[PDB]
A paper describes a structure:
Although co-crystallization of 2-HID with various substrates and analogs was explored, only a structure of 2-HID complexed with p-nitrophenol, a product of the carboxylesterase reaction, was obtained and well-defined electron density was observed for the ligand. The ligand is located in a pocket formed by the loops β1-β2 (P16-L17) and β3-β4 (L29-S31) in the N-terminal region, helix α5 (L222-V226), loop β10-α4 (D269-F271), and helix α7 (H301-F306), including many hydrophobic residues (e.g., Leu17, Leu29, Ala85, Leu222, Ala223, Val226, Phe203, Phe271, and Phe305). In the bottom are Thr168 and Ser169 in helix α4 and a glycine-rich motif, Gly83-Gly84-Ala85, in loop β6-α1. Several charged residues are located in the pocket, including Glu89, Asp269, Glu270, and His301, which may play key functional roles. The location of this pocket is similar to that of the substrate-binding pocket identified in the structure of carboxylesterase AeCXE1 and is also similar to the gibberellin (GA) binding pocket observed in the structure of gibberellin receptor GID1. Sequence and structural comparative studies with AeCXE1 showed that 2-HID possesses two corresponding catalytic triad residues Asp269 and His301, and the catalytic Ser is replaced by Thr168. As observed in the structure of the complex of 2-HID with ligand, p-nitrophenol forms a hydrogen bond with Thr168 which is regarded as the nucleophilic residue for AeCXE1. However, in the 2-HID structure, the CG2 atom of Thr168 is close to His301 and its OG1 atom points to another side and forms a hydrogen bond with p-nitrophenol. In addition, Ser169 in 2-HID is also close to p-nitrophenol and could interact with substrate, whereas the corresponding residue in AeCXE1 is Ala170. The 2-HID mutants D269A, H301A and T168A had no or weak carboxylesterase activity on the p-nitrophenyl valerate, and the activity of mutant S169A was reduced to 52 % of that of wild-type enzyme.
Isoflavonoids play important roles in plant defense and also exhibit a range of mammalian health-promoting activities. Their biosynthesis is initiated by two enzymes with unusual catalytic activities; 2-hydroxyisoflavanone synthase (2-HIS), a membrane-bound cytochrome P450 catalyzing a coupled aryl-ring migration and hydroxylation, and 2-hydroxyisoflavanone dehydratase (2-HID), a member of a large carboxylesterase family that paradoxically catalyzes dehydration of 2-hydroxyisoflavanones to isoflavone. Here we report the crystal structures of 2-HIS from Medicago truncatula and 2-HID from Pueraria lobata.
Residue numbers in the entry: 9 to 325
Amino acid sequence: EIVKEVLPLIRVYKDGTVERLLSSPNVAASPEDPETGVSSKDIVIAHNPYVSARIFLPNINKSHNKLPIFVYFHGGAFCVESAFSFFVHRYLNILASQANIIAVSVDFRLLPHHPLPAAYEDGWTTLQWIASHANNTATNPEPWLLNHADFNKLYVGGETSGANLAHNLLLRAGNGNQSLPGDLKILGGLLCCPFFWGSKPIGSEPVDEHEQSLAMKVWNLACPDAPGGIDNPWINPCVAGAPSLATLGCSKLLVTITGRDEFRDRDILYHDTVKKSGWEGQLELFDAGDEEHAFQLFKPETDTAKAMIKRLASFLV
Ligand SMILES: O=[N+]([O-])c1ccc(O)cc1
């Protein structure tokens, strides 16, 4: 008995069993990935609500300086994909080695059982957990963080909905009422093809088909009780009455887009809005080329993919 369905992403049955789109199976963490030299392990950030993660530590050939931390949130429209998939594992191995940074891939809660803002909270739980290492308030600290992490170089980011998640975290961080343990600051944000939408079609978005877009079905699954619906500031950050993008709680921000991504114009609008908002930080835009969103995870061997990774490495510093 089917209660909910957003094809091709997800089907939900009466008894809470779910069929999910699966683009790659999960793989085991590695003591040393053969191609990149990156070590990875799987850890528990919080038991309840349960939030786990894979942390990636690149080859330590020198240890004069500690390494930037990159908290990554996978794509998958809040309802599919995983922190531990073949694609994410292989991508972060490359990123961690090419950029020489520690990566933390967060397995945040998903629809159907955990509607937004669950995922957002899990992201915030992750950042608190990280900051608790910096001021020695962590209870079961991850030794890799204590030994190798530069806590003043915390970067937060992701793909599509994961990037929407990071964006939301940046706002929380730059809100005066909210702070991290030790008042740790996020240095930078990296949003790759972030999932943003709106009730009115814009740019090259098809007008007649708009109200039937997959983006709208995804959002209705993720947050049906959202006031304003598809114009809720969580999904439409450029909407009237949304918090000002001048309160983004970081100092540097890179937005990446692709030519074929559905959210290209939304992303472009987001960037321009950040620019003409008075946000004082360093703002950057990167057009990765004639590709789909997340293309670099699927085909990291292409010239286009390699150029994107090099770009990211120059940002994650
Ligand atoms: O990957 N994602 O997070 C997505 C993918 C497709 C979509 O329509 C919305 C979000």
